[PDB]
Scaffold this motif. Structure first.
Motif, PDB file in Angstrom:
ATOM      1  N   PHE A 200       0.832  -1.202   0.000  1.00  0.00           N
ATOM      2  CA  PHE A 200       0.000   0.000   0.000  1.00  0.00           C
ATOM      3  C   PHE A 200       0.874   1.261   0.000  1.00  0.00           C
ATOM      4  N   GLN A 201       0.230   2.429   0.016  1.00  0.00           N
ATOM      5  CA  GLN A 201       0.948   3.698   0.026  1.00  0.00           C
ATOM      6  C   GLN A 201       1.789   3.838   1.291  1.00  0.00           C
ATOM      7  N   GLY A 202       2.726   4.786   1.254  1.00  0.00           N
ATOM      8  CA  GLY A 202       3.644   5.017   2.338  1.00  0.00           C
ATOM      9  C   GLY A 202       3.404   6.336   3.047  1.00  0.00           C
ATOM     10  N   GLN A 203       4.420   6.767   3.794  1.00  0.00           N
ATOM     11  CA  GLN A 203       4.323   8.027   4.521  1.00  0.00           C
ATOM     12  C   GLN A 203       4.186   9.182   3.541  1.00  0.00           C
ATOM     13  N   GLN A 204       3.404  10.186   3.929  1.00  0.00           N
ATOM     14  CA  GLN A 204       3.185  11.369   3.099  1.00  0.00           C
ATOM     15  C   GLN A 204       3.182  12.586   4.014  1.00  0.00           C
ATOM     16  N   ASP A 205       4.170  13.456   3.849  1.00  0.00           N
ATOM     17  CA  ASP A 205       4.262  14.711   4.583  1.00  0.00           C
ATOM     18  C   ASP A 205       3.936  15.874   3.647  1.00  0.00           C
ATOM     19  N   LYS A 206       3.677  17.037   4.235  1.00  0.00           N
ATOM     20  CA  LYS A 206       3.302  18.210   3.455  1.00  0.00           C
ATOM     21  C   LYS A 206       4.212  19.373   3.804  1.00  0.00           C
ATOM     22  N   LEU A 207       4.562  20.142   2.785  1.00  0.00           N
ATOM     23  CA  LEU A 207       5.422  21.306   2.924  1.00  0.00           C
ATOM     24  C   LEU A 207       4.698  22.490   2.312  1.00  0.00           C
ATOM     25  N   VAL A 208       4.523  23.552   3.094  1.00  0.00           N
ATOM     26  CA  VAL A 208       3.868  24.770   2.629  1.00  0.00           C
ATOM     27  C   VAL A 208       4.931  25.836   2.398  1.00  0.00           C
ATOM     28  N   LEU A 209       4.956  26.389   1.187  1.00  0.00           N
ATOM     29  CA  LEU A 209       5.996  27.312   0.768  1.00  0.00           C
ATOM     30  C   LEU A 209       5.403  28.575   0.167  1.00  0.00           C
ATOM     31  N   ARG A 210       6.133  29.674   0.324  1.00  0.00           N
ATOM     32  CA  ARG A 210       5.873  30.917  -0.387  1.00  0.00           C
ATOM     33  C   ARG A 210       6.951  31.061  -1.451  1.00  0.00           C
ATOM     34  N   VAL A 211       6.530  31.160  -2.709  1.00  0.00           N
ATOM     35  CA  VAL A 211       7.432  31.224  -3.857  1.00  0.00           C
ATOM     36  C   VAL A 211       7.356  32.617  -4.476  1.00  0.00           C
ATOM     37  N   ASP A 212       8.492  33.281  -4.562  1.00  0.00           N
ATOM     38  CA  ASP A 212       8.659  34.544  -5.264  1.00  0.00           C
ATOM     39  C   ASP A 212       9.496  34.291  -6.509  1.00  0.00           C
ATOM     40  N   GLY A 213       9.299  35.126  -7.524  1.00  0.00           N
ATOM     41  CA  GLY A 213      10.004  35.000  -8.783  1.00  0.00           C
ATOM     42  C   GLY A 213       9.139  34.541  -9.933  1.00  0.00           C
ATOM     43  N   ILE A 214       7.884  34.186  -9.676  1.00  0.00           N
ATOM     44  CA  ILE A 214       6.945  33.834 -10.739  1.00  0.00           C
ATOM     45  C   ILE A 214       6.401  35.153 -11.282  1.00  0.00           C
ATOM     46  N   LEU A 215       6.938  35.598 -12.421  1.00  0.00           N
ATOM     47  CA  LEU A 215       6.529  36.864 -13.019  1.00  0.00           C
ATOM     48  C   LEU A 215       5.567  36.697 -14.188  1.00  0.00           C
ATOM     49  N   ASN A 216       5.478  35.501 -14.760  1.00  0.00           N
ATOM     50  CA  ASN A 216       4.606  35.274 -15.902  1.00  0.00           C
ATOM     51  C   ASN A 216       4.254  33.795 -15.966  1.00  0.00           C
ATOM     52  N   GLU A 217       3.359  33.473 -16.901  1.00  0.00           N
ATOM     53  CA  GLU A 217       2.873  32.106 -17.011  1.00  0.00           C
ATOM     54  C   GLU A 217       4.006  31.146 -17.326  1.00  0.00           C
ATOM     55  N   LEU A 218       5.020  31.611 -18.056  1.00  0.00           N
ATOM     56  CA  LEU A 218       6.137  30.738 -18.401  1.00  0.00           C
ATOM     57  C   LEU A 218       6.908  30.324 -17.157  1.00  0.00           C
ATOM     58  N   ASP A 219       7.180  31.283 -16.264  1.00  0.00           N
ATOM     59  CA  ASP A 219       7.885  30.970 -15.025  1.00  0.00           C
ATOM     60  C   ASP A 219       7.131  29.932 -14.203  1.00  0.00           C
ATOM     61  N   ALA A 220       5.800  30.037 -14.148  1.00  0.00           N
ATOM     62  CA  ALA A 220       5.019  29.054 -13.406  1.00  0.00           C
ATOM     63  C   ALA A 220       5.197  27.657 -13.989  1.00  0.00           C
ATOM     64  N   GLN A 221       5.075  27.530 -15.315  1.00  0.00           N
ATOM     65  CA  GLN A 221       5.236  26.223 -15.946  1.00  0.00           C
ATOM     66  C   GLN A 221       6.635  25.676 -15.715  1.00  0.00           C
ATOM     67  N   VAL A 222       7.644  26.547 -15.726  1.00  0.00           N
ATOM     68  CA  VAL A 222       8.994  26.103 -15.386  1.00  0.00           C
ATOM     69  C   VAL A 222       9.001  25.497 -13.990  1.00  0.00           C
ATOM     70  N   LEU A 223       8.421  26.208 -13.018  1.00  0.00           N
ATOM     71  CA  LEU A 223       8.386  25.707 -11.648  1.00  0.00           C
ATOM     72  C   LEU A 223       7.627  24.389 -11.563  1.00  0.00           C
ATOM     73  N   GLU A 224       6.453  24.315 -12.197  1.00  0.00           N
ATOM     74  CA  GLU A 224       5.691  23.068 -12.190  1.00  0.00           C
ATOM     75  C   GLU A 224       6.493  21.931 -12.814  1.00  0.00           C
ATOM     76  N   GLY A 225       7.303  22.240 -13.829  1.00  0.00           N
ATOM     77  CA  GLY A 225       8.176  21.224 -14.398  1.00  0.00           C
ATOM     78  C   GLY A 225       9.230  20.744 -13.420  1.00  0.00           C
ATOM     79  N   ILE A 226       9.820  21.671 -12.658  1.00  0.00           N
ATOM     80  CA  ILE A 226      10.794  21.284 -11.640  1.00  0.00           C
ATOM     81  C   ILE A 226      10.154  20.336 -10.635  1.00  0.00           C
ATOM     82  N   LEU A 227       8.941  20.677 -10.173  1.00  0.00           N
ATOM     83  CA  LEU A 227       8.302  19.872  -9.137  1.00  0.00           C
ATOM     84  C   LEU A 227       7.950  18.487  -9.652  1.00  0.00           C
ATOM     85  N   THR A 228       7.479  18.401 -10.896  1.00  0.00           N
ATOM     86  CA  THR A 228       7.071  17.118 -11.454  1.00  0.00           C
ATOM     87  C   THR A 228       8.244  16.168 -11.643  1.00  0.00           C
TER      88      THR A 228
END
Length: 78
Positions: A1-29
């Motif tokens: 079955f599934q394992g341990q799952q923790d959560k991290l809440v972050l404030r991210v600065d530097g997202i100036l446009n839609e492209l920057d967001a997709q870059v960040l989402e790519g990093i996370l994925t």
């Protein structure tokens, strides 16, 4: 079955446009141990669900910063 799952809440600065967001989402994925996340591109609020047996919050925050080439500024919220 599934394992341990923790959560991290972050404030991210530097997202100036839609492209920057997709870059960040790519990093996370591509980051090992990240299971799910929710990002509000406007407020910069980022929640990350990760497997603590694969990655620590420390390594996770450092990983995003490194993969971002200093474009993203991360602050952990308590």
């Amino acid at each position: 079955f599934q394992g341990q799952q923790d959560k991290l809440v972050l404030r991210v600065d530097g997202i100036l446009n839609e492209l920057d967001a997709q870059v960040l989402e790519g990093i996370l994925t591509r980051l090992n141990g990240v299971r799910q996340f929710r990002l509000d591109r406007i407020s910069g609020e980022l929640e990350v669900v990760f497997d603590p047996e694969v990655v620590s919050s420390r390594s996770l925050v450092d990983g995003i910063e490194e993969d971002g080439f200093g474009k993203f500024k991360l602050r952990v919220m308590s």
